[PDB]
């Protein structure tokens, strides 16, 4: 298959807030992911991080290891310390057959901080962009030399949140640095997912099909809520949820027209007691494959 459909375990057990889905075992998450029809799944905090142990739980369920989030600290640590911090991840990904590493600068991020409003998120001083981009590119050239493509995950609560900042990451990196286009964080960050795709599709190496509930996002902005408070209130949902406001097909149409190959991952943080992951992830996969057909991406 030229298009593979993935999921992310934070639908089942949240990574940032371990009180969300704490009771849901790895075994349940993986059973339901396979049963729903996903081709693979991304790293979650309950995943073994050794190759044999991770293979032992994914292979019985027909699940490929899509990729894993790896946190960056380029703003406080040297490049060589950051290459040495990503290497264990690069080795696991190779042993698992994965082709992508997902990265985000978190050294000053606030999305994991429950008590910090999202409006207080860090902004990278204008003079530090050139150095920061160069450092990201150095990790991506390092990764590429090993078969792994770096995809940068712009993210609420980080220095890469707005559309303008996505454009600055793209100006100050390349050619090995790719963009992970997350439709949910892009709209949450007041950006236009379609317009971002128009500009950067040729650099997009990985796509997260995430939806937002416009009602809840407007609540987050007005009441000054943290990222994890938005998550608990349902700021995110899946493709095809009527309460959502992301327009998926135009983004998938841009991807089709330039020949995107690879994964589309449904990543939807929700409170799983209220928003059953089996239900919402079933809805997501059903709707995203429809949208991908309508877009001519999945032919």
Residues of this chain that interact with Mn ion (CB under 5 A) are 182, 208, 267
We find the least distance from the C-beta atom of residue 197 to Mn ion, in angstroms, to be 15
Evaluated on CA atoms 175, 180, 186, 192, the torsion sign reads positive
Q: Report how far apart, in Å, the C-alpha atoms of 239 and of each of 106, 113, 247, 280 are.
A: 27, 27, 9, 9
We find the least distance from the C-beta atom of residue 95 to Mn ion, in angstroms, to be 23
130: Cβ contacts below 8 Å, ≥ 6 apart: 172
Evaluated on CA atoms 74, 187, 183, 118, the torsion sign reads positive
Report the C-alpha gap between 97 and 294 in whole angstroms. 30
Nearer to Mn ion, 241 or 267 (CB): 267
Q: Report how far apart, in Å, the C-alpha atoms of 54 and of each of 41, 58, 65 are.
A: 12, 6, 9
Nearer to Mn ion, 32 or 182 (CB): 182
Nearest residue (beta carbon) to Mn ion: 208
Report the C-alpha gap between 38 and 174 in whole angstroms. 31
Report the C-alpha gap between 172 and 268 in whole angstroms. 29
Nearer to Mn ion, 186 or 225 (CB): 186
We find the least distance from the C-beta atom of residue 71 to Mn ion, in angstroms, to be 14
We find the least distance from the C-beta atom of residue 84 to Mn ion, in angstroms, to be 25
We find the least distance from the C-beta atom of residue 204 to Mn ion, in angstroms, to be 13
What secondary structure letter does DSSP report for 22? T
Nearer to Mn ion, 40 or 138 (CB): 40
Evaluated on CA atoms 267, 140, 191, 159, the torsion sign reads positive
We find the least distance from the C-beta atom of residue 278 to Mn ion, in angstroms, to be 20
Nearer to Mn ion, 138 or 270 (CB): 270
Nearer to Mn ion, 82 or 267 (CB): 267
Q: Report how far apart, in Å, the C-alpha atoms of 189 and of each of 80, 118, 176, 186, 228 are.
A: 31, 10, 25, 5, 15
Residue 200: closest CA among 163, 245, 248 = 163
We find the least distance from the C-beta atom of residue 153 to Mn ion, in angstroms, to be 6
Nearer to Mn ion, 138 or 264 (CB): 264
């Amino acid at each position: 298959h030229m298009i593979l459909y993935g999921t992310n375990p934070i639908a089942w057990s949240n990574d940032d807030d371990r009180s969300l889905g704490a009771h849901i075992t790895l075994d349940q998450c993986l059973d339901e992911a396979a049963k729903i029809g996903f081709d693979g799944i991304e790293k979650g905090h309950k995943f073994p991080q050794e190759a044999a142990a991770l293979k032992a739980v994914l292979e019985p369920r027909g699940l490929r290891y899509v990729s894993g989030w790896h946190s960056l600290n380029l703003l406080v640590n040297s490049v060589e310390e950051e290459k040495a911090a990503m290497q264990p991840a690069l080795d696991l990904l190779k042993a698992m057959g994965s082709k992508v590493i997902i990265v985000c600068e978190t050294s000053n991020a606030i999305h994991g901080d429950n008590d910090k409003p999202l409006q207080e998120r860090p902004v990278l001083e204008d003079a530090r962009w050139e150095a920061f981009g160069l450092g990201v590119e150095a990790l991506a050239a390092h990764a590429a030399a090993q078969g792994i493509t770096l995809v940068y995950h712009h993210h609420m609560g980080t220095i890469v949140e707005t559309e303008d900042e996505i454009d600055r990451l793209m100006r100050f990196t390349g050619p090995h640095t790719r963009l992970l286009l997350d439709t949910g964080h892009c709209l949450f960050g007041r950006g236009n997912p379609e317009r971002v795709a128009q500009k950067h599709i040729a650099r997009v190496g990985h796509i997260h099909a995430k939806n937002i509930r416009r009602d809840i996002v407007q609540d987050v902005r007005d009441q000054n809520l943290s990222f994890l408070e938005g998550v608990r209130r349902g700021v995110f949902t899946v493709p095809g949820d009527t309460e959502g406001s992301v327009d998926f097909v135009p983004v998938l149409k841009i991807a089709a027209e330039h020949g995107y190959q690879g994964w589309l991952v449904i990543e939807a943080e929700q409170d799983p007691d209220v928003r059953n992951p089996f239900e919402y992830q079933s809805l997501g996969l059903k709707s995203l494959k429809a949208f991908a057909r309508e877009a001519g991406l999945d032919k």
